[PDB]
Amino acid sequence: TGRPEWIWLALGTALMGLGTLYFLVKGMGVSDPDAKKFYAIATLVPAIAFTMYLSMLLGYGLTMVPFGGEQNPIYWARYADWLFTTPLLLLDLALLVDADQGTILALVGADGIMIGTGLVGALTKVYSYRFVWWAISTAAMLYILYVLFFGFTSKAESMRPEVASTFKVLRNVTVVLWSAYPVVWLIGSEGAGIVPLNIETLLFMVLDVSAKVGFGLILLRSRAIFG
Ligand SMILES: *C/C=C(C)/C=C/C=C(C)/C=C/C1=C(C)CCCC1(C)C
Numbered sequence: 001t002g003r004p005e006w007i008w009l010a011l012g013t014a015l016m017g018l019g020t021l022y023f024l025v026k027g028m029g030v031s032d033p034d035a036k037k038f039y040a041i042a043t044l045v046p047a048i049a050f051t052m053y054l055s056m057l058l059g060y061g062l063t064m065v066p067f068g069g070e071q072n073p074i075y076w077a078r079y080a081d082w083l084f085t086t087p088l089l090l091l092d093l094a095l096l097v098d099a100d101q102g103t104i105l106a107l108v109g110a111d112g113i114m115i116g117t118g119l120v121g122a123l124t125k126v127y128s129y130r131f132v133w134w135a136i137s138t139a140a141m142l143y144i145l146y147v148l149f150f151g152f153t154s155k156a157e158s159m160r161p162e163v164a165s166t167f168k169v170l171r172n173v174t175v176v177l178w179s180a181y182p183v184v185w186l187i188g189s190e191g192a193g194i195v196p197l198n199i200e201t202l203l204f205m206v207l208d209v210s211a212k213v214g215f216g217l218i219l220l221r222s223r224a225i226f227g
Contacts, residue, residue: 001059005201009057012205016050019213023220034095038225041092042216045085049212052081053205067127072189073197078204079119087111089215093148093174096167096224097156107144114140122190134191138182145175159224166224170215177211 020043027039055061061077087108094104114137121133148171156167184207185191188200195203219225 004196004198006057008198008201008205009053012209013050013053013057015205015209015213016046016053019046019209019216020050023216026220032226034227035225038092038095038219041088041095042220045088046212046216048085049081049208052077053208063123065123065125067125067130068193070193072193074122074190075201076119076122079115079122081208082118083112083115085212086115089174089211090144090148092215092219093152093167093170096163096170096219097152097159099152099155103147103151107147110140110143110147113137114144118185122185130190131186134182134185141178141182145178149175162222163224166219166222170219173215173218174211177207180207 023039023043023046027036027043030036030039052061056075056077061075061080063074063076064071065074066072090107090111091104093099094107099107117133117140118137121130121137124130124133153168153171156164156171159167180203184195184200184203187194188203189195189197
């Protein structure tokens with residue numbers, strides 16, 4: 001097929017793979033139980049992304065959806081990825097600040113909605129309805145971000161400064177990167193079709209990698225993961 005976006009996907013496949021192996025090798029060495037906990041979670045994240053980037057690189061996870069008079073290319077493998085990686089990332093922030101079970105469940109549930117409605121919207125054939133779903137998905141995301149900024153940060157102040165400071169960074173990177181996804185979707189192939197697929201894939205790969213390997217590197221090299 002040789003599609004214009006394949007290179008970004010070949011690049012993102014390689015970064016997710018490298019990041020996975022490094023986190024894997026580093027965590028197989030750690031003896032502390034909950035350091036292990038954080039390692040196990042942070043390694044699985046890019047591992048999943050890798051498999052998905054790799055499947056897409058290989059021609060899977062792609063579907064043509066009809067709307068706006070065109071046969072639009074929609075990479076659904078993405079949601080298969082995010083469906084499990086996004087909640088895992090949230091779990092990590094939750095474990096860091098000792099979030100409560102109820103909080104966690106609510107975050108993972110909101111997260112389920114966000115990716116679910118997102119996909120439904122990416123698949124919708126009535127142009128204008130694609131944005132209704134998008135809207136809902138974004139609302140869900142905002143709920144998540146609100147909790148993290150208002151809820152979590154608050155509980156991160158019952159921990160040691162080292163832990164609170166590691167959390168604020170991770171919280172920050174997350175707020176900035178996550179915020180970007182809905183905008184990329186809106187102006188990209190799934191939305192207005194203004195940014196071409198190849199550039200769109202480049203944006204997502206930069207965000208996916210930053211948010212997973214970038215997030216992992218920061219968290220794992222901190223002593224806040226120790227019991
Ligand atoms: C490793 C992947 C990460 C951290 C992915 C984060 C993805 C989002 C914050 C996605 C959000 C979306 C919306 C708010 C609405 C439209 C559809 C999505 C799923 C692209």
